[PDB]
Amino acid sequence: AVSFIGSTENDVGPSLGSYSRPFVYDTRNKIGYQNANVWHISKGFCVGLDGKVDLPVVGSLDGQSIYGLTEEVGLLIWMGDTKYSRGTAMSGNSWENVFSGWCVGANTASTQGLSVRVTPVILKRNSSARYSVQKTSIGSIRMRPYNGSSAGSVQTTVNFSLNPFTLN
Ligand SMILES: CC(=O)N[C@H]1[C@H](Oc2ccc([N+](=O)[O-])cc2)O[C@H](CO)[C@@H](O)[C@@H]1O
C-alpha cells in the first residue's frame, strides 16, 4: 500500500533569514526543507522520486544550472531523498530522477521522505551590497512507483516555495 502523509505546500529556509560571506554563499542546509515522512508505504511497495525546477535557467556551474531570481541573485538547487547528502544537483526545467529508489519489505511498513536544498549565488554585484529576494516558487517533487507498484489515486506531487531572504 501507499498513502500521502506530508504537506502539499512547503517553504524552503527561514522567513527573512539573512546570510553573509559568480559568488556562491556557504549556507549549508539552512535554506532547505527536509521531511522523512511524506508517503507511508508497506508490503513490497517500490518507490523513487522525480524533481522539477520551474525557475528560469540563467547560467551554469560545474555541470548544474544556476537558476535566476533577480538580476543580482540566483540559486544552485539540489533535490532528493530525505538525507541532505543524497541530494541530486538540478539542471534545466524537466522532470529529473533525483532518487533511484527502494522497496519496503513484503511484510513491513515504513515511509518515503525527501529534501530540497539551495545555495544563493551573486550573479552581478550591485552598489547596495545588500540583496533581497521575495517568496518565489521553486518547483516540485513527485514519487515514482516502480516494479509494477501503483499510486492508485494517491496524491503523487508536492510543491516548494523559497522563503524570502537577504544577502549581505
Ligand atoms: C526514517 C523513516 O521513517 N523513513 C525513511 C526510510 O528509512 C528506512 C528505515 C528502515 C529500513 N529498513 O530496511 O529497515 C529502510 C529505510 O528510508 C527511506 C529511503 O531512504 C527514506 O525516504 C525515509 O525517510
UniProtKB/Swiss-Prot annotation:
Intracellular or extracellular location(s)? Fimbrium
Q: Which gene encodes it?
A: f17aG
Q: Which domain of life is it from?
A: Bacteria
Disulfide bridge partners, by residue number: 46-103
Which keywords describe this protein according to UniProt?
Disulfide bond, Fimbrium, Lectin, Signal, Virulence
Q: Name one GO biological process term.
A: adhesion of symbiont to host
A GO cellular component entry from the record: pilus
Which named protein is this? F17a-G fimbrial adhesin
One MF term in the entry's GO annotations: carbohydrate binding
Residue segments, region Receptor-binding lectin domain = 1-168
Q: Give the species this sequence originates from.
A: Escherichia coli
The Swiss-Prot or TrEMBL record describes its family as follows: Belongs to the fimbrial protein family.
Please give the function described in this protein's UniProt entry: Essential fimbrial adhesion factor that mediates binding to N-acetylglucosamine-containing receptors in the host intestinal microvilli, leading to colonization of the intestinal tissue, and diarrhea or septicemia. Also confers adhesiveness to laminin and basement membranes.
